[PDB]
Design a protein around this ligand. Structure first.
Ligand SMILES: *[C@@H]1O[C@H](CO)[C@@H](O[C@@H]2O[C@H](CO)[C@@H](O)[C@H](O)[C@H]2NC(C)=O)[C@H](O)[C@H]1NC(C)=O
Ligand SMILES: *[C@@H]1O[C@H](CO)[C@@H](O[C@@H]2O[C@H](CO)[C@@H](O)[C@H](O)[C@H]2NC(C)=O)[C@H](O)[C@H]1NC(C)=O
Ligand SMILES: *[C@@H]1O[C@H](CO)[C@@H](O)[C@H](O)[C@H]1NC(C)=O
Ligand SMILES: *[C@@H]1O[C@H](CO)[C@@H](O)[C@H](O)[C@H]1NC(C)=O
Ligand SMILES: *[C@@H]1O[C@H](CO)[C@@H](O)[C@H](O)[C@H]1NC(C)=O
Ligand SMILES: *[C@@H]1O[C@H](CO)[C@@H](O)[C@H](O)[C@H]1NC(C)=O
Lengths: 171, 54, 162, 54, 171, 172
């Protein structure tokens, strides 16, 4: 994708992340665990459903049209009926093809972005207390128990509390 | 089609009788084509030309 | 139009026989004909010039269905219509159709080498239908009410279901 | 003849009389015919006798 | 948007920024102030006028066409005229819908991008002399008066001048 | 572009980079050099060939159609034949214009992206041992010979080896 997160610096997806699209995996002094991130998960889902609903909205209603099958050769008038119809179908078919190519490219790039956006947000909370290991993981340079990790996950992590500890360990 | 329209070949204008029982994917009519038989017209000429060509 | 609603009108056909039928078109056990059409023939030894009118004093368009008989032989032509050649002319204030029947054989169908040709004429409010014939007229009995809307037709062998 | 270098549009018509009496009064012949043609086209029209709405 | 700046890490827009689309707000020892950034604002403006000028460029000129309203029922030929026209209108109507959907998404995404690009440039000038607070603001770890701020805004900030001071303050 | 790398923080392209689309230029104690980045160049190339093959895929095959030129005025039926065709052409003409407009915007942004993605990867390998000078160049705060640079280029650079040396140079 354009952002290089999904199928990029994130090496692979997590088959085991079954209650969210994006999330956190951790290891600390109390062991390891997993949690979906709801805001990013919900961000991808809402965009895709909005998009999906735009696409499947409002078929046209048509009633009396033209004949499209013919049991006798007639020539000029039939040729025109057949040409008009044939042309219409190819145009719609192109539209259909184009619609999905652009939509799918866009669905992929927006999901990659959400991954990247979650990652950047995590980095920003951590300030100087962690370093990006380059594989979508942060090495956190201080003691950080389950409540601390959760403090990161729920967006209330207070970097100042841990800053002294972390910098000494980093440097 | 050379000197012949598809219709002149169809009816069998003599200088076009060379084209008898012939087949094609694409028949090519030349601007130099001419009729040389009884003078005639075809109501809905365009359709006959179309349906034979097809 | 989406409907077959039909309204009979009291046409008067002076000096002709009405309600012609054929064993090609049986209705119950006897000869019969299309229900919406009226096959007119000679009365006694004559078939007069028909000349009839029907004003549209309604505020919708009327569809009139009518026809022309093409007999297979001259004996038949004269037997039915007396005249050696018939004619049917149907017109409105802004339209007209005149049809001359053509005698001769067509392929034998349901016992008949003869044919009927069907034509239609629409008459708008304030317009009027005039019918003029000295033979071979297959007359209308009335008109179909014309509607506009979403109705259509489809060819299918799919079964209907609920 | 068209000895000009543009197309000419000719407008013409055919009268449909209301009675056989009218037809012969005007035209003597009991049934008329009008034929207008070019070198590769033709139109022949037979008038139609009968009453139409006034 | 895809970049997560506008309606993202920048928490909201500034109703008070009336002389630019993007800009700076600061606090220092001499007080606070605001200034539009001309280059990024102009970058967004030039692209949007460009797309817009592309969209409103060159209407088609048409003259003799077909009748599109009819006063009499005629059947087969009229059905086709009406079908051809009805079909044409639905195709163009579809194009119009699609064109604006794609453009508007792209207009939204390109502006988020310019925001993100201005932010990234500021970070890069500042080098090790500031930290991203995660809300579109930088904490600058040295005394930085109005001329210093202006040096940042106009692209001449000299990170080396302040590095000793800033690092002492950070660490 | 959307990512701001090409025609952005990378001030200009390198006319001299002729064996790759993206790459590295370096200066160290053994001199200077250049190398194409293989993965990114190929990443950009595959997408452009992919899109292109999609674009040049499958023309329609048509046979008997309608007449499109006429030697006589005929009126209503000819008007309709000409209108249908004229309409078809304007629609396709629109589709063609739109397709290339969209592809090119996308081609430009994806190439900008690969630059940005390559740049980000380089930053990440370097950890705390280098700083982004802001113009697409990294300042490396340790002695870094040709094998070291190549270790960066081939993705095997071990940041820990140099960290003590580098941090000392950055902060002290
Ligand atoms: C079809 O509908 C028409 C129109 O409603 C029916 O014609 C009516 O017939 C009744 C009984 O003779 C008359 O009293 C009305 O004056 C007619 N209505 C109109 C508006 O003309 C007709 O009966 C129906 N056809 C059949 C066979 O049921
Ligand atoms: C013209 O020729 C046709 C074809 O032979 C005749 O149609 C036949 O009519 C007979 C007598 O009723 C039928 O038994 C046959 O089935 C018909 N033959 C075919 C091949 O259809 C027709 O009668 C002739 N017309 C006249 C007036 O003589
Ligand atoms: C975030 O998680 C931590 C640990 O579970 C909890 O103590 C804290 O209250 C949470 N923050 C808020 C404000 O919800
Ligand atoms: C035939 O009937 C119409 C309608 O009443 C009338 O106007 C016309 O005069 C009649 N024609 C003749 C010649 O009787
Ligand atoms: C930026 O602002 C400072 C303070 O006014 C000024 O001295 C400096 O010349 C500016 N930089 C440039 C090159 O515009
Ligand atoms: C990276 O480059 C160095 C120097 O050429 C080489 O020795 C090493 O094998 C490379 N790393 C790998 C695993 O390709």
């Amino acid at each position: 994708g354009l952002f290089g997160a999904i199928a990029g610096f994130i090496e692979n997806g997590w088959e085991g992340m079954i209650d969210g699209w994006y999330g956190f995996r951790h290891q600390n002094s109390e062991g390891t665990g997993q949690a979906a991130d709801l805001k990013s998960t919900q961000a991808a889902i809402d965009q895709i459903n909005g998009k999906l609903n735009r696409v499947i909205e409002k078929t046209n209603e048509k009633f009396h049209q033209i004949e499209k099958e013919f049991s006798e050769v007639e020539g000029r008038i039939q040729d025109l009926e057949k040409y008009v119809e044939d042309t219409k179908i190819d145009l719609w078919s192109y539209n259909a093809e184009l619609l999905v190519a652009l939509e799918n490219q866009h669905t992929i790039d927006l999901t990659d972005s959400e991954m990247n956006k979650l990652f950047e947000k995590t980095g920003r909370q951590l300030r100087e207390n962690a370093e990006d290991m380059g594989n979508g993981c942060f090495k956190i340079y201080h003691k950080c128990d389950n409540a601390c990790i959760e403090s990161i996950r729920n967006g209330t992590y207070d970097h100042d509390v841990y800053r002294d500890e972390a910098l000494n360990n980093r440097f | 089609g050379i000197d012949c329209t598809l219709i002149d070949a169809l009816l069998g204008d003599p200088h076009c009788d060379v084209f008898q029982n012939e087949t094609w994917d694409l028949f090519v009519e030349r601007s130099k084509a001419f009729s040389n038989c009884y003078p005639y017209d075809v109501p809905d000429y365009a359709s006959l030309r179309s349906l034979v060509a097809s | 139009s989406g409907t077959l609603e039909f309204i009979t009108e009291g046409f008067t056909w002076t000096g002709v026989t009405q309600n012609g039928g054929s064993n090609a078109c049986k209705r119950g056990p006897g000869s019969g004909f299309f229900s919406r059409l009226n096959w007119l023939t000679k009365s006694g030894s004559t078939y007069p010039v028909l000349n009839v009118t029907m004003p549209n004093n309604d505020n919708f368009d009327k569809l009139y269905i009518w026809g022309v008989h093409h007999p297979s032989t001259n004996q038949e032509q004269t037997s039915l219509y007396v005249q050696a050649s018939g004619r049917v002319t149907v017109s409105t204030r802004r339209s007209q159709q005149t049809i001359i029947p053509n005698i001769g054989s067509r392929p034998w169908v349901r016992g008949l080498s003869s044919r009927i040709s069907i034509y239609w004429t629409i008459v708008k409010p304030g317009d009027v239908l005039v019918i003029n014939s000295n033979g071979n007229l297959i007359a209308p009995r009335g008109y179909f009410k014309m509607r506009t809307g979403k109705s259509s037709i489809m060819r299918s062998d799919a079964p209907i279901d609920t």
